Amino acid sequence: KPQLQRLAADADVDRMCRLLEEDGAFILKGLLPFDVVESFNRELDVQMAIPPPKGERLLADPHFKYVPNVATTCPTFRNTVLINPVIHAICEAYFQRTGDYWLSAAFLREIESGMPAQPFHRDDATHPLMHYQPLEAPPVSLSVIFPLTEFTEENGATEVILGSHRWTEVGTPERDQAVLATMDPGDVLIVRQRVVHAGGGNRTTAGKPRRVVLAFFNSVQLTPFETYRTMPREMVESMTVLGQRMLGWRTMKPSDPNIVGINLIDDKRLENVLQLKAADS
């Protein structure tokens, strides 16, 4: 059975665009260097060791290891991963027809041993209107998936069904229709909108849990799952322009027919109203 294509991180972007439309997913080898993976990994270690908050936990409410909006608490992600050029070439190619995109969410998941796999699904629950968008419409969401442990047959490599974005419905596909996204930390799995998939769970009996970071880039038309308006100003101005843009701190622009933009106020750009500085401005 045809497997997921592995690609060198410096591969030409049009093949990745091509692959997204043909297979619906692909893998980049060694996009993030080891030291970058290492820092992010110890930054996330801090948040995991931070005691549990007592209020309500909207998504956490058995054992659900999970760090939300890692961009506010993980400098490596905020300052390096989020702005990674290869990622954004893909995005610009992919969001060609829809226009500006930004970060709807990026959060950590750990999968303990002996957890059942996911059921096959499409990433269309956060914005259910996507369920009704036809395949031909301009895509408005892109799943980017960072392994931070080994992804193996054993621990539950992500399962993808290639080409399945062409289906009208998910239905009940069989596990042996999927292929495995086995990768090493530093690699990245990129999944097109409408592609059917499932996390593998974890069938190790005893051992370290599989750790994945899930990033969702959507058209700026879609409301971000996580709002970054509470980030302190000084933290925001320490980011590059592109980083500020991805986190909803600037005015954006869906493609024409929208000739004006979005996320604006007083008929001005938000960043100008806020007198916003940036690492690279």
Site string for its own copies, 108-147 (x = CB under 8 A): ----------------xxxxxx-xxxx-xxx-x-------
Q: Hey, is 210 helix, strand or coil?
A: strand
Q: Which whole-number Å values give the CA distances from 243 to 75, 87, 235, in the listed order?
A: 12, 13, 11
Pairing mode of beta strands 268-269, 264-265? antiparallel
φ/ψ of 110, rounded to 5, equals: -115, 140
CA pair distance 243, 71, nearest whole angstrom? 10
Q: Is 159 in the site for Fe ion (CB under 5 A)?
A: no
Residue 270: count of CB within 10 angstroms of its CB = 19
* Span from 18-26, 80-88, 180-188, 263-271 in contact with its own copies (CB under 8 A): 263-271
- By CB under 8 A, name the one of 7, 17, 43, 69 that touches its own copies: 69
- Residue 205 forms beta bridges with which residues? none
Q: Is 177 in the site for its own copies (CB under 8 A)?
A: no
* Residues whose CB falls within 8 Å of the CB of residue 213, separated by 6 or more in sequence, listed in order: 40, 44, 70, 77, 106, 107, 108, 109, 145, 146, 148
156 binds, among Fe ion, its own copies, none (CB under 5 to 8 A by kind): none
Q: Is 257 in the site for its own copies (CB under 8 A)?
A: yes
- By CB under 8 A, name the one of 221, 238, 242, 277 that touches its own copies: 221
> What single DSSP character describes residue 138?
P
Cis peptide before 185 (omega within 30 of 0): no
Q: Is 244 in the site for its own copies (CB under 8 A)?
A: no
269 binds, among Fe ion, its own copies, none (CB under 5 to 8 A by kind): its own copies
Instruction: Check: CB of residue 77 under 8 Å from CB of residue 71.
Output: yes
133 binds, among its own copies, Fe ion, none (CB under 5 to 8 A by kind): its own copies
CA pair distance 43, 104, nearest whole angstrom? 21
- Residue 7 forms beta bridges with which residues? 28
Closest approach of its own copies to the CB of residue 86, in Å: 26
- By CB under 8 A, name the one of 59, 96, 166, 175 that touches its own copies: 59
Helix 13-22 vs helix 85-94: angle between axes, to the nearest 10 degrees?
50
Closest approach of Fe ion to the CB of residue 33, in Å: 26
CB closer to its own copies, 3 vs 223: 223
Q: Which of 126, 163, 148 lies closest to 65, judged by CA?
A: 148
Size, binding site for Fe ion by CB under 5 A: 1
CB closer to its own copies, 84 vs 255: 255
26 binds, among its own copies, Fe ion, none (CB under 5 to 8 A by kind): none
Closest approach of Fe ion to the CB of residue 20, in Å: 16
Q: What does the binding site for Fe ion look like in residue numbers (CB under 5 A)?
A: 123
Q: Where do contacts with its own copies occur on this chain (CB under 8 A)? A: 53, 55-60, 66, 68-69, 72, 98-99, 124-129, 131-134, 136-138, 140, 219-230, 251-252, 254-270, 272-274
